[PDB]
Amino acid sequence: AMLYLIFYDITDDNLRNRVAEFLKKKGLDRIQYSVFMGDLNSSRLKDVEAGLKIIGNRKKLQEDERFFILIVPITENQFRERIVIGYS
Amino acid sequence: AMLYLIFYDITDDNLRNRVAEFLKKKGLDRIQYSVFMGDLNSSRLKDVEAGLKIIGNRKKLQEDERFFILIVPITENQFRERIVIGYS
């Protein structure tokens, strides 16, 4: 299994909570309000993709609404080399 | 230079626009409302980190406010293997 980083930008609170709940249930580690990470083999990755697509199987309602999920393979080393910036 | 993915979750519109403007000026490619990518050597990465920290050199004002920036090294292959999910 490769490791994946999953980031999302979902303006609708209910859809956003649905995504967070789904990703938690599939076993991914939450690392920020809208970021998860974890290992996914082919089967589990397919299941994740398919379920996220169901949550997104919607039309947008207001022009400023966003629903975006990016899933990218990374390595544990790359993650250890991350830079995180927050409020001072 | 390594490639980097930069994701952010910034609830304050003015700080968010300041970050987007800064990253555009430093030459990164915008790939989503709150995501950029591009190559950064040591010097340029340091300059990016330092400027983002200045924008974040704030205290939080409301409990729901967020300011989070994640910078992660990735490869062009990993990026080509990304999965993107939006509205159907």
Short mmCIF file of C-alpha atoms in Angstrom, two decimals:
data_model
loop_
_atom_site.label_atom_id
_atom_site.label_comp_id
_atom_site.label_asym_id
_atom_site.label_seq_id
_atom_site.Cartn_x
_atom_site.Cartn_y
_atom_site.Cartn_z
CA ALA A 1 0.00 0.00 0.00
CA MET A 2 1.11 3.49 -0.81
CA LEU A 3 0.52 6.39 1.50
CA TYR A 4 -1.87 9.10 0.35
CA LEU A 5 -2.52 12.66 1.40
CA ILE A 6 -6.10 13.80 1.07
CA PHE A 7 -6.96 17.51 1.11
CA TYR A 8 -10.38 18.99 0.61
CA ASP A 9 -12.08 22.35 0.24
CA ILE A 10 -15.82 21.91 0.78
CA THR A 11 -17.84 24.96 1.62
CA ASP A 12 -21.12 23.17 2.49
CA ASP A 13 -20.89 22.18 6.18
CA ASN A 14 -23.06 19.08 5.79
CA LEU A 15 -21.15 17.70 2.80
CA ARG A 16 -17.89 18.55 4.53
CA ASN A 17 -18.90 16.61 7.66
CA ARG A 18 -20.05 13.68 5.47
CA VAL A 19 -16.58 13.55 3.87
CA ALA A 20 -14.76 13.78 7.23
CA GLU A 21 -16.98 11.02 8.64
CA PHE A 22 -16.42 8.77 5.61
CA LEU A 23 -12.65 9.18 5.68
CA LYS A 24 -12.48 8.51 9.41
CA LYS A 25 -14.53 5.32 8.97
CA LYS A 26 -12.30 4.07 6.15
CA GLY A 27 -9.41 4.33 8.66
CA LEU A 28 -7.45 7.39 7.52
CA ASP A 29 -5.60 9.62 10.01
CA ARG A 30 -6.91 13.15 10.37
CA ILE A 31 -4.11 15.66 10.40
CA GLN A 32 -6.03 18.94 10.07
CA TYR A 33 -9.62 20.14 9.83
CA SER A 34 -9.67 19.34 6.08
CA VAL A 35 -6.69 17.01 5.65
CA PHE A 36 -6.28 13.23 6.08
CA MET A 37 -3.50 10.80 5.38
CA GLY A 38 -3.02 7.08 5.33
CA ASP A 39 -2.13 3.94 3.45
CA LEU A 40 -4.51 2.68 0.73
CA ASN A 41 -3.97 -0.28 -1.51
CA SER A 42 -5.83 -0.57 -4.84
CA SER A 43 -9.04 -1.96 -3.38
CA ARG A 44 -9.28 0.56 -0.56
CA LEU A 45 -8.36 3.47 -2.78
CA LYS A 46 -11.12 2.55 -5.24
CA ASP A 47 -13.63 2.34 -2.40
CA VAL A 48 -12.53 5.80 -1.13
CA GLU A 49 -12.77 7.35 -4.60
CA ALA A 50 -16.19 5.83 -5.25
CA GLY A 51 -17.67 6.96 -1.96
CA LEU A 52 -16.33 10.50 -2.27
CA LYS A 53 -17.86 10.69 -5.76
CA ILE A 54 -21.26 9.76 -4.28
CA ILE A 55 -21.04 12.55 -1.76
CA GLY A 56 -20.15 14.91 -4.60
CA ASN A 57 -22.93 13.65 -6.94
CA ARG A 58 -24.64 17.01 -6.70
CA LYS A 59 -24.98 20.16 -8.62
CA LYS A 60 -23.56 23.32 -7.18
CA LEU A 61 -26.24 25.74 -5.87
CA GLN A 62 -24.52 29.11 -5.22
CA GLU A 63 -21.62 30.45 -7.33
CA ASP A 64 -19.24 30.65 -4.42
CA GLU A 65 -19.84 27.05 -3.26
CA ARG A 66 -16.89 24.71 -3.68
CA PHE A 67 -16.40 20.97 -3.52
CA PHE A 68 -12.90 19.81 -4.24
CA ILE A 69 -10.98 16.77 -3.04
CA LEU A 70 -7.36 16.05 -4.02
CA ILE A 71 -5.86 12.63 -3.28
CA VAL A 72 -2.08 12.38 -3.91
CA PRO A 73 0.36 9.56 -3.27
CA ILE A 74 3.27 10.59 -1.02
CA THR A 75 5.97 8.79 0.98
CA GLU A 76 6.54 8.82 4.74
CA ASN A 77 9.82 10.64 4.08
CA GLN A 78 8.11 13.37 2.06
CA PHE A 79 5.65 13.80 4.84
CA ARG A 80 8.39 14.07 7.46
CA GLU A 81 9.83 16.87 5.27
CA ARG A 82 6.59 18.87 5.32
CA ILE A 83 6.44 22.49 6.47
CA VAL A 84 3.34 23.54 8.43
CA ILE A 85 2.44 27.15 9.00
CA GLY A 86 -0.21 28.36 11.42
CA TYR A 87 -0.88 31.44 13.46
CA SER A 88 2.05 32.64 15.54
CA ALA B 1 14.72 21.94 -7.19
CA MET B 2 12.06 19.66 -5.83
CA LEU B 3 8.42 20.10 -6.62
CA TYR B 4 6.11 21.10 -3.78
CA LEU B 5 2.38 20.99 -3.26
CA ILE B 6 0.97 23.78 -1.14
CA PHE B 7 -2.50 23.49 0.38
CA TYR B 8 -4.11 25.99 2.69
CA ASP B 9 -7.23 26.42 4.79
CA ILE B 10 -7.59 30.09 5.71
CA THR B 11 -10.97 31.31 6.81
CA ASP B 12 -10.19 35.06 6.84
CA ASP B 13 -10.78 36.33 3.28
CA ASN B 14 -8.13 39.06 3.50
CA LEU B 15 -5.39 36.77 4.82
CA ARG B 16 -6.40 34.14 2.28
CA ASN B 17 -6.08 36.63 -0.60
CA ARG B 18 -2.71 37.81 0.79
CA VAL B 19 -1.44 34.19 0.69
CA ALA B 20 -2.76 33.58 -2.84
CA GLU B 21 -1.18 36.83 -4.03
CA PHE B 22 2.18 36.01 -2.40
CA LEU B 23 2.31 32.51 -3.87
CA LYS B 24 1.41 33.76 -7.35
CA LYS B 25 4.17 36.39 -7.16
CA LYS B 26 6.77 33.83 -6.08
CA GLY B 27 5.92 31.96 -9.31
CA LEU B 28 3.92 28.94 -8.16
CA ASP B 29 1.15 27.44 -10.32
CA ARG B 30 -2.37 27.71 -8.94
CA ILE B 31 -4.24 24.47 -9.31
CA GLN B 32 -7.33 25.14 -7.18
CA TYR B 33 -8.82 27.95 -5.11
CA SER B 34 -6.58 27.01 -2.15
CA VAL B 35 -3.88 24.87 -3.77
CA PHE B 36 -0.59 25.73 -5.52
CA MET B 37 2.28 23.71 -6.85
CA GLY B 38 5.72 24.34 -8.21
CA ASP B 39 9.45 23.83 -7.99
CA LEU B 40 11.36 25.46 -5.10
CA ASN B 41 15.02 25.10 -4.36
CA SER B 42 16.38 25.79 -0.86
CA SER B 43 16.58 29.56 -1.24
CA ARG B 44 13.12 29.96 -2.72
CA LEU B 45 11.54 27.56 -0.27
CA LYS B 46 12.98 29.52 2.66
CA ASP B 47 11.65 32.77 1.20
CA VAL B 48 8.17 31.18 0.79
CA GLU B 49 8.16 29.82 4.35
CA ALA B 50 9.31 33.14 5.81
CA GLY B 51 6.74 35.20 3.97
CA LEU B 52 3.86 32.87 4.84
CA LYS B 53 4.90 33.07 8.50
CA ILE B 54 4.65 36.87 8.33
CA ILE B 55 1.13 36.68 7.00
CA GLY B 56 0.30 34.28 9.82
CA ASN B 57 2.00 36.39 12.55
CA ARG B 58 -1.37 37.04 14.14
CA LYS B 59 -3.46 35.81 16.93
CA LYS B 60 -6.71 34.08 16.14
CA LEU B 61 -9.80 36.22 16.90
CA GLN B 62 -12.86 33.90 16.73
CA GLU B 63 -12.79 30.22 17.78
CA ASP B 64 -13.82 28.96 14.38
CA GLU B 65 -11.14 30.92 12.48
CA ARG B 66 -8.45 28.80 10.87
CA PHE B 67 -5.07 29.50 9.31
CA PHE B 68 -3.23 26.45 8.12
CA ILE B 69 -0.71 25.99 5.33
CA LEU B 70 0.85 22.62 4.45
CA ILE B 71 3.85 22.50 2.09
CA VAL B 72 4.87 18.97 1.00
CA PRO B 73 7.50 17.79 -1.46
CA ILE B 74 6.07 15.59 -4.24
CA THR B 75 7.24 14.33 -7.63
CA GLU B 76 5.76 15.02 -11.07
CA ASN B 77 4.86 11.32 -11.26
CA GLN B 78 2.98 11.43 -7.95
CA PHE B 79 1.10 14.42 -9.17
CA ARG B 80 0.18 12.72 -12.44
CA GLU B 81 -1.24 9.90 -10.26
CA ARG B 82 -3.52 12.26 -8.33
CA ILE B 83 -7.28 11.72 -8.07
CA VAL B 84 -9.47 14.83 -8.13
CA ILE B 85 -13.09 14.79 -7.08
CA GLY B 86 -15.54 17.61 -7.67
CA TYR B 87 -19.25 17.98 -8.14
CA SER B 88 -20.76 15.66 -10.73
#
